[PDB]
Amino acid sequence: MAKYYTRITMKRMAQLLDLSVDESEAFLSNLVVNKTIFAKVDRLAGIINFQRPKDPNNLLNDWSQKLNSLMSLVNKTTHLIAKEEMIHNLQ
Amino acid sequence: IISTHLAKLYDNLLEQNLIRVIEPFSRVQIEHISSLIKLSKADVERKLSQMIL
C-alpha cells in the first residue's frame, strides 16, 4: 500500500488490517523507526501519508530526464519511417 | 559510588526515550505522549520546553 497509495486516512487502513487503530500505529512505529518504510502519521486528524518532501534539485532533474527520453524516441522514429518508405516507393 | 551517577544516567536515558517516542510521527497531543512515557503532563511539558530551547 505504501508502494501504491500516497495519502490515506487512519481508519481505512486500520479496517484493511482487520485490527484496531492503536495496534496499527504501534505496529508501524517500530517499522518506521527501523528505517524500512517511511511515513509521517498525524494523530490529530487521523491522516497519514508517505510522499517524501520535494527538493528543488529533483524536480527539474526529472524534467531533464523526460526531455532526454523524448529526444531519444523522436530520433528513433525517423529510421523506422525511412525503412517503411524504402520497401514500397523505391520502384 | 553508584548512587552518585544513578541520577544522571536516569536523566540521560529519559531524554533518549522521549526523543525515540516522539520521533516516528509529527503533531500530536500531550496526553498520548504522557501515556506512552508514563509520566505526568507538567513535567513532560517542561522537559519538552528545555529540549526545544
Curated annotation (Swiss-Prot), chain A:
Residues modified to N6-acetyllysine: 3
Disease linked to the protein: Stankiewicz-Isidor syndrome: A neurodevelopmental disorder characterized by delayed psychomotor development, intellectual disability, behavioral disorders, mild dysmorphism, ophthalmologic anomalies, feeding difficulties, deafness, and variable congenital malformations of the cardiac and/or urogenital systems.
Described function: Component of the 26S proteasome, a multiprotein complex involved in the ATP-dependent degradation of ubiquitinated proteins. This complex plays a key role in the maintenance of protein homeostasis by removing misfolded or damaged proteins, which could impair cellular functions, and by removing proteins whose functions are no longer required. Therefore, the proteasome participates in numerous cellular processes, including cell cycle progression, apoptosis, or DNA damage repair.
Similarity comment: family membership: Belongs to the proteasome subunit p55 family.
Oligomer and partners: Component of the 19S proteasome regulatory particle complex. The 26S proteasome consists of a 20S core particle (CP) and two 19S regulatory subunits (RP). The regulatory particle is made of a lid composed of 9 subunits including PSMD12, a base containing 6 ATPases and few additional components. Interacts with ERCC6.
Protein name, as recorded: 26S proteasome non-ATPase regulatory subunit 12
Species for this entry: Homo sapiens (Human)
Encoding gene per record: PSMD12
Swiss-Prot record, chain B:
Ranges in coiled-coil conformation: none
Subcellular location, record wording: Nucleus; Cytoplasm, Cytosol
Tissue specificity comment: Highly expressed in embryonic stem cells (ESCs). Expression decreases as ESCs differentiate.
Induction context: By FOXO4; expression in embryonic stem cells (ESCs) is mediated by FOXO4.
Modifications the protein undergoes after translation, according to the UniProt entry: Phosphorylated by AMPK.
Domain of life: Eukaryota
Subunit structure: Component of the 19S proteasome regulatory particle complex. The 26S proteasome consists of a 20S core particle (CP) and two 19S regulatory subunits (RP). The regulatory particle is made of a lid composed of 9 subunits including PSMD11, a base containing 6 ATPases and few additional components.
Function: Component of the 26S proteasome, a multiprotein complex involved in the ATP-dependent degradation of ubiquitinated proteins. This complex plays a key role in the maintenance of protein homeostasis by removing misfolded or damaged proteins, which could impair cellular functions, and by removing proteins whose functions are no longer required. Therefore, the proteasome participates in numerous cellular processes, including cell cycle progression, apoptosis, or DNA damage repair. In the complex, PSMD11 is required for proteasome assembly.
Similarity remark: Belongs to the proteasome subunit S9 family.
Identification of the protein by name: 26S proteasome non-ATPase regulatory subunit 11
Species this protein is from: Homo sapiens
Lineage: Eukaryota, Metazoa, Chordata, Craniata, Vertebrata
Gene name linked to the record: PSMD11
